[PDB]
Amino acid sequence: ALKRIHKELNDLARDPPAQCSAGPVGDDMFHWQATIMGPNDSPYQGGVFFLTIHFPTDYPFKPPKVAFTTRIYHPNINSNGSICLDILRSQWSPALTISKVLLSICSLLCDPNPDDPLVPEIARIYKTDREKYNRIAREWTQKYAM
Amino acid sequence: SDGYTPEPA
């Protein structure tokens, strides 16, 4: 757990992801805060989003719990900030790094997976009127992410 | 639940 978490945090400051950063809050190495600047291929462009990361003591044989602290309008992310992302559940493997998780969360912003929605309402909009979606989305970045 | 159990200890 620890010596591994410590290493991820080092390797993290060596080669920083683009539009992402993370680190422990306080003295607790099992709790980090992360930031993702919404990418330019997304309606979240120019927004800035906060996440929490909780490392189970199972780590890294079980994935971390990642969630959005900032409000975001997305089909795969709910009011709770919970993220439906495969590598966070079934597709986890212990060789994965937080850097990889964050990177993918960014992917999921540019290109959501509505075939597997967290928020059924929003999933139907992204599919039906994509302008309607981009609009609410850019608006929620306006309010919450900027 | 395939019929196989863990090794005797």
Added chain:
Amino acid sequence: PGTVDKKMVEKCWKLMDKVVRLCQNPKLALKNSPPYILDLLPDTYQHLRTILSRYEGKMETLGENEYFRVFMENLMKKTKQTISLFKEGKERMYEENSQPRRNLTKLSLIFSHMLAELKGIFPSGLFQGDTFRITKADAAEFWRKAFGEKTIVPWKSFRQALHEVHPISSGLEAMALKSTIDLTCNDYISVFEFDIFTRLFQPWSSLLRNWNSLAVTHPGYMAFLTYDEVKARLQKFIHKPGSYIFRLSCTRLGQWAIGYVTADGNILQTIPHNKPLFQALIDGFREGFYLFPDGRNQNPDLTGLCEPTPQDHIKVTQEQFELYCEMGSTFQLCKICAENDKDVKIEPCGHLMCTSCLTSWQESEGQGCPFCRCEIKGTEPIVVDPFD
């Protein structure tokens, strides 16, 4: 043997179908457990069908593949063999102890073995045979030196090649070996079958001596036996705790299945995983569980092959070193937990790690190499000697 057109792949289907309709017979009442005909045949059909889709318009080059030619011939011979088993067996098919019935179970095993082989060579329906990855590396090096990228070789060609490295001392011993290793019973040895056997009989260095000690001279070894058969056979011993036998597992080929009787009189069946058969037999005897093979009072001493030539150490290279330093740590260290030196090699993939992490990953219901996520067919313990 003969070229495979789609009229033939048609003929096999019609034939497999008949074998199924036979086995659906209410009077037969086949037990649902592996190997199980009413799964295997449909699933083989499904898989074939899958290969065909993949080869559309390429039917020319699929027909010419030697493994596939050999498979479709053996598959036909075997179904035909089954269909005339019933024909001649008549009603003796419904006496569960009948010899016809035991042949039908032998056949179930084989159909299973054939499907596993088929999935191995054409995992997604695409022919991987030339790229197939032999689990054990000494085994791999043997096959590659002798047979190149060949997926399948005639038995006599295999016998001659192998004999050059591990001497087979006789005809009788040669026949016993063929019968052990030729799981599909086609007189050929596939790179797949080579894998199963070398995994079963490792280490490679003592592979014939291993096979002699574990099968040829061993009262507990049961060829072509079924989980249900293993249960029945140990029934006569339910009053003698420590009685045990062992066989190829059919749902994980290349792994061993040990049946045994327990202090309280239950028959249980276990799979040593990643652990070589003898160590298990040695520990099991020492620890009281595996005592009287097939009931016999005498239990063989396997300490003979307990002294294998040690695998070497990998020795990090100047190239590697300077890389892992610019990364901040040592190549030698397990990049999963970060607290241990790598003690184990995942096979066939080759990836290195510490056993604690391997064990915790597997116990976590995780599957396959935590790095490349290829399936873990084998483990070899090792030691790394750092550059410093």
